[PDB]
Design a protein around this nucleic acid. Structure first.
Ligand SMILES: [Zn+2]
Lengths: 726, 162
DNA sequence: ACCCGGGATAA
DNA sequence: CTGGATGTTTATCCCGGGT
RNA sequence: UCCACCAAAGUUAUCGCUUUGGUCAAUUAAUGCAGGUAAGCAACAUCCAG
């Protein structure tokens, strides 16, 4: 039978026993650093070997075994039998030791004692190898083509030829043909020649380009030939023999001032990341057990730390054939429970057939994907006096994500932002030895503080990031009690009040005590305060009751409570996923209710490319989600669909001038032409009112959906696309 | 007009009883919700709800039987119910009215007025008045503070209807 | 003498 | 913030140390 | 370097338009939906690219 894997998300606090929480937190704090050092150390070794001897075997070292040795080199342990080591293992360890001493001083890192780290190394390094393969497979050919274009000087030749023909006043017809004959076609021939490892015709490239090409080819073996006479296909099929060439390609790109790209994957994020927790890892690192854990006791050991009676852990899927195999991932806050059913032993609407298109009558919904508006849905039965229109805006989905980002950028301590700015000045993606070493030193200079700030959720916090700061409570219109940013609770009985602002200011201090009592009783607030601070806060609260007029007590309380101001970044990350899932289900509910349960969706062919000044949009993942929910979805061409008036097929134009919709660009530009509004030029389109003359006004999305309906009706009647929209 | 009686205990010592009379005919939903909470036949009620906000010479407040800090409370109709009308006004001392956090935010909390409150008209729904035990109301009021925090801990031990 | 951590390799 | 590629473990053997 | 949603008027199917009536969980919470409690379902991590 086939195999599939499903994952269920949850939280540590909900399934993890309190007694075993602290061991897990330390384990993540250790694994995260080791993995990060493994990435940096591995790159450091390669740049040391490649920058000193071009005869290095970098191509042969891309294997899980080498990464495991690198990961273990950072762990101090009692060495076992030495004669049982394989020759490959000895060579890898010797190579690692060749630079181990230098790297530690460069990175200012000390070995960490972590017994039973074999499994952790295997999983983390397996991911490392996967990242290395995927990174090159995705961008090897893409970057090679860019380098070839730069070597051919396509931009320079096009500019020179275009300007030369401008002096001769040649038309676009001649210019676009001369450029094609003299630039594009020769470039294609050069690419074809390079694709087979053979040099291009002499004279097409300058001496420097030819020398660089020879240097690039020297990376490969002289007698080696690309499979199927295609370098691009060979790399995908056999990437094992192109890593060194990929590095040389990156070096050439940097030499030509091209934007640096990360050839060697690196973990730059300081927030802890998810790590696998195998049964053995749980047995040794978490449970602190000191003996072998057999498979039969695997479930018993797991049940000692987590509750297996929860629905999340129990069987799932059709026929309850999916079982939890004692494997999961966690980053200290979130948990991913994996389930598998196997043992651990190792169509466009135009091209639809008659049997389908003719049976969709009365159930087609037209969707126009916009930029600011994610979707503009209109039902085919809509009329002017019957508006079956639905708008799904970008604000609805990005409400939570934008809110978290705003909170993070406001609560960032001055020291943290300065450290981030200083660290960001170094180009990590660069392959230069000097620059990479400088980045390592810069990162290591503030690695401790950054980890402490971002690890405030679980790691002990000893440094206070908000000194000389006074905090006070406040209440909004909805009677929500906010402590600077902390949400305490909603005071449902806050409106009843006497005349505002009594002359006795000291009464405000007494109100602070009431707010403190409303705050210290909150579950999420009490759990974040240690016993000693809570006792001191209570003592200060008692003093405030006896001596409200003294502001020193409030200042001390604010200083003690400054810990709570640290944001739980991991929880925000988990909440972002929940909000996205809720919005996706929210969208499904709206589609089913607003239009119908068995509605058929028609979507445009626009791919929504990512562009500057335009944040991402849902174009590709949306189709997968809609098809997963079971909504019949079909694609329709958008060619000139919004360029004509639905009422009379006349051309449309933009006429209103509006202040720059993007507020940050208002300073740069007062007004810009309207985006989503159009009017019909033809004067006969509208039953115009008297004395002024007028024309029908349309929305860009509204016109598009109306034209989509016209195409749908024409296809249903004759199955031929209208000539106007073809 | 249904009558409501409360037993008030301060610092563990009973201090008296207060009797309220509700304008059920004028404010049906609020009176019904108040009656249900006082009876306690639904497994919950004012039993144990303290007076968390008492301002001397101004007002008494209470009815938080879930948190006892002015943030909790619910209603038989759910989390909140819409308002009904303002046929009654805070024109006399001792009037019993609902404490809320805005339109349609009424819950279980209530407040008792000790002086005329013309400014509160059109904001809070008045649905009752004190008919007996006004001396106990003054006694409870004397224990309040300008900030609303009571000098002593006052809790309604029992509630009922008559 | 006789057994316990801890590492290492392997399918 | 969105899109794309690849995973998602458990036995068996040997020794310095301890007793 | 900014922005929750429903609907009415300007209005003609009228804009990152103006005025209105209404909606609410705010959150640094919770694994989510779902059915009125039990039932049934729900792919996660790493890296890279913009
Ligand atoms: Zn027209």
């Amino acid at each position: 039978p086939s195999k599939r894997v499903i994952t269920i998300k949850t939280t540590i606090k909900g399934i993890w026993k309190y007694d075993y929480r602290q061991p897990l937190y330390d384990l993540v704090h250790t694994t995260n650093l080791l993995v990060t050092h493994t990435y940096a150390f591995t790159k450091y070794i390669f740049l040391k070997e490649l920058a000193t001897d071009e005869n290095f075997a970098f191509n042969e070292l891309i294997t899980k075994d080498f990464f495991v040795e690198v990961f273990l080199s950072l762990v101090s342990a009692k060495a076992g039998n030495s004669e049982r080591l394989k020759d490959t293992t000895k060579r890898y360890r010797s190579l690692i030791g060749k630079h181990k001493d230098a790297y530690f001083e460069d990175a200012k890192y000390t070995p960490i004692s972590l017994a039973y780290a074999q499994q952790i190394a295997l999983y983390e390094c397996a991911k490392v190898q996967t990242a290395y393969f995927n990174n090159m497979k995705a961008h090897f050919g893409n970057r090679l083509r860019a380098l070839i274009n730069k070597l051919f000087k396509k931009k320079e030749k096009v500019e020179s030829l275009t300007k030369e023909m401008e002096a001769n006043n040649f038309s676009i017809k001649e210019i676009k043909q001369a450029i094609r004959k003299n630039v594009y076609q020769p470039c294609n021939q050069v690419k074809l020649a390079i694709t087979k490892k053979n040099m291009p015709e002499s004279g097409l490239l300058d001496d420097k380009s030819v020398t660089q090409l020879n240097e690039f080819f020297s990376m490969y073996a002289v007698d080696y030939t690309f499979q199927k006479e295609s370098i691009f296909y060979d790399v995908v099929a056999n990437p094992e023999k192109h890593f060194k060439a990929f590095y040389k390609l990156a070096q050439l790109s940097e030499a030509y001032e091209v934007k640096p790209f990360a050839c060697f994957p690196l973990r730059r994020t300081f927030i802890p990341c998810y790590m696998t927790v195998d049964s053995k890892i749980l047995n040794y690192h978490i449970l602190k057990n000191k003996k072998v854990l057999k498979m039969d006791e695997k479930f018993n050991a797991w049940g000692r730390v987590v509750n297996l009676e929860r629905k999340a852990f129990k069987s799932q899927g059709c026929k309850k054939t999916l079982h939890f195999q004692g494997t999961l991932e966690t980053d200290g806050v979130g948990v991913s429970i994996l389930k598998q059913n196997t043992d651990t032993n190792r169509k466009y609407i135009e091209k639809l057939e008659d049997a389908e298109l003719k049976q969709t009558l009365g159930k087609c919904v037209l969707m126009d994907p916009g930029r600011r508006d994610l979707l503009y849905c209109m039902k085919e039965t809509s009329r002017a006096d019957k508006k079956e229109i639905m708008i799904f805006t970008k604000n609805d989905r990005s409400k939570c994500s934008r809110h978290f980002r705003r909170l993070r950028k406001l609560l960032q301590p001055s020291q943290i932002r300065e450290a981030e700015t200083y660290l960001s000045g170094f180009a990590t993606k660069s392959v230069n030895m000097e620059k990479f070493v400088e980045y390592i030193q810069a990162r290591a200079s503030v690695k401790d503080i950054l980890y402490e700030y971002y690890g405030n959720e679980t790691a002990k916090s000893i440094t206070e990031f908000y000194p000389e700061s006074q905090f006070d409570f406040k209440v909004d219109q909805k009677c929500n009690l906010y402590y600077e940013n902390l949400f305490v609770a909603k005071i449902r009985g806050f409106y009843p009040q006497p005349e505002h602002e009594p002359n006795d200011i000291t009464l405000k201090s007494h109100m602070y005590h009431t707010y403190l009592q409303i705050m210290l009783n909150q579950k999420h607030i009490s759990e974040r305060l240690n016993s000693e601070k809570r006792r001191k806060i209570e003592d200060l609260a008692k003093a405030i009751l006896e001596q409200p007029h003294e502001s020193g007590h409030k200042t001390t309380i604010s200083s003690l409570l400054g810990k709570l101001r640290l944001l739980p970044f991991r929880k925000m990350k988990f909440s972002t996923k929940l909000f996205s899932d809720n919005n996706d289900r929210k969208l499904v509910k709206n589609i089913k209710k607003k239009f119908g349960a068995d509605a058929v969706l028609v979507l445009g062919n626009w791919s929504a490319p990512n562009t500057k000044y335009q944040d991402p949009t849902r174009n590709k993942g949306l189709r997968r989600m809609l098809k997963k929910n079971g909504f019949p979805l079909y694609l329709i061409d958008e060619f000139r669909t919004s360029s004509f008036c639905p009422k009379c097929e006349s051309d449309l134009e933009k006429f209103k001038v509006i202040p720059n919709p993007r507020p940050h660009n208002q300073e740069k530009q007062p007004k810009v032409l309207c985006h989503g509004l159009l009017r019909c030029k033809n004067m006969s389109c509208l039953e115009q009112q008297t004395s002024e003359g007028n024309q029908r006004l349309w929305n860009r999305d509204q016109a598009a959906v109306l034209n989509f309906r016209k195409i749908l009706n024409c296809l249903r009647e004759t199955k031929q696309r209208p000539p106007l929209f073809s | 007009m249904s009558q409501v009686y409360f037993d008030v205990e301060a610092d563990g010592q009973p201090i008296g009883r207060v009797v309220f009379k509700l304008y059920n005919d004028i404010v049906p939903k609020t009176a019904e919700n108040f009656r249900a909470l006082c009876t306690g036949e639904k497994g919950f009620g004012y039993a144990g709800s303290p007076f968390h906000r008492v301002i001397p010479d101004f007002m008494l407040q209470g009815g938080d039987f879930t948190a006892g800090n002015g943030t909790g409370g619910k209603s038989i109709y759910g989390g909140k119910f819409p308002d009904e009308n303002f046929k009654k006004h805070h024109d006399r001392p001792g009037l019993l009215s609902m404490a809320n956090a805005g339109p349609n935010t009424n819950g279980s909390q209530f407040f008792i007025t000790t002086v005329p409150c013309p400014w509160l008209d059109g904001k809070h729904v008045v649905f009752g008045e004190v008919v007996d035990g006004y001396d106990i109301v003054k006694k409870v009021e004397s224990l309040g503070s300008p900030s609303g925090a009571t000098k002593a801990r006052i809790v309604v031990a029992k509630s009922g209807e008559l």
